[PDB]
């Protein structure tokens, strides 16, 4: 609590056809996406708000595997390996929409909890249409990079505030987010539901550093190397075992790689994005 599991590596438990989806679902978020009917793996691409300028794009798609899906684009909106002494890195207390629900001394970071602000009443607005319309009680967020971080916060949201709560989240390059409070948090509201991606040598997860006060949640899964379908889980928050032990890379290479044969390449990748193509 607040440390750093030292726990063995374990086989790779989760479902990869759904991690390969999810990975499609959120490259589409770097694509224009009111493209009217979009189809990716078993998905159907129902609406989308934001455009990667001022906002992150955020697509709702329906689909039989993962209910009604919610993707965050993580383009840079602001820049990660840039001055951490700015504003955008501070922590700051939940916002006041639900701070009523988190541990005292909840501390997030300003840079992804703003950003998730602009966009969280049109999210539970959209969630709850097309839940209605689809009669479906499954909700999934999907997060990459930046997005991944506002995902997070998204999926703790929705399963505190959204009535039914949350399905899963899959999260790709999550950069950190929260204080050992809030990583904890999350491990219990949503530990089961939580899974976080991480490719080869990237090195986003591991900004905002923890000597600012930050903490993963508990468990990601490494694909090692990156782009192959190697992946062991590394268990517990903040796992000694894991990624720190290959030097990390120092640009968006295995960022915008292949995550279980979809490639989540960002700006330059596929557009229309193409689930298992890879
Ligand atoms: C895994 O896949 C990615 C692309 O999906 C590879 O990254 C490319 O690498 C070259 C230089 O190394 C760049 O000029 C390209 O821009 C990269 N592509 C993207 C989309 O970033 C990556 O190197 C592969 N990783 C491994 C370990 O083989
Ligand atoms: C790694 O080592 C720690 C303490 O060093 C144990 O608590 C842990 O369970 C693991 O074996």
Do not use: C
């Given at each position: 609590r607040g440390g750093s599991s030292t726990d063995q590596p374990v086989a790779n438990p989760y479902n990869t056809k759904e991690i390969s989806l999810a990975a499609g679902l959120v490259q589409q978020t770097y694509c224009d996406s009111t493209e009217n009917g979009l189809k990716i793996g078993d998905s159907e691409l129902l609406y989308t708000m934001g455009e990667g300028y001022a906002r992150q794009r955020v697509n709702i798609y329906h689909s039989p595997?993962?209910?009604?899906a919610v993707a965050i684009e993580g383009t840079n909106?602001?820049?990660?390996?840039?001055?951490?002494?700015?504003?955008?890195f501070w922590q700051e207390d939940?916002?006041?929409?639900?701070?009523?629900?988190?541990?005292?001394?909840?501390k997030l970071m300003h840079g992804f909890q703003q950003a998730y602000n602009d966009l969280m009443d049109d999210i539970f607005t959209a969630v709850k249409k097309y839940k209605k319309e689809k009669n479906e009680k499954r909700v999934t967020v999907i997060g990459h990079s930046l997005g991944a971080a506002m995902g997070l916060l998204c999926a703790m949201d929705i399963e505190l505030?959204?009535?039914?709560?949350?399905?899963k989240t899959y999260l790709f390059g999550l950069p950190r987010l929260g204080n050992p409070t809030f990583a904890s948090f999350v491990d219990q509201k949503i530990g089961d539901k939580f899974h976080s991606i991480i490719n080869g040598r990237?090195?986003?997860?591991?900004?905002?550093?923890?000597?600012?006060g930050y903490q993963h949640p508990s468990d990601y899964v490494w694909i090692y190397p990156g782009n192959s379908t190697s992946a062991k889980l590394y268990p517990?928050?903040?796992?000694?075992?894991?990624?720190?032990?290959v030097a990390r890379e120092f640009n968006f290479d295995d960022h915008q790689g292949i995550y279980f044969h979809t490639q989540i390449g960002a700006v330059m990748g596929e557009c229309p994005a193409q689930v298992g193509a890879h």
């Open positions: 595997s993962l209910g009604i909106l602001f820049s990660l390996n840039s001055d951490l002494h700015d504003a955008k939940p916002n006041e929409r639900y701070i009523q629900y988190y541990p005292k001394g909840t505030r959204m009535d039914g709560g949350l399905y990237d090195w986003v997860p591991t900004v905002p550093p923890r000597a600012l517990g928050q903040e796992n000694v075992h894991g990624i720190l032990t």
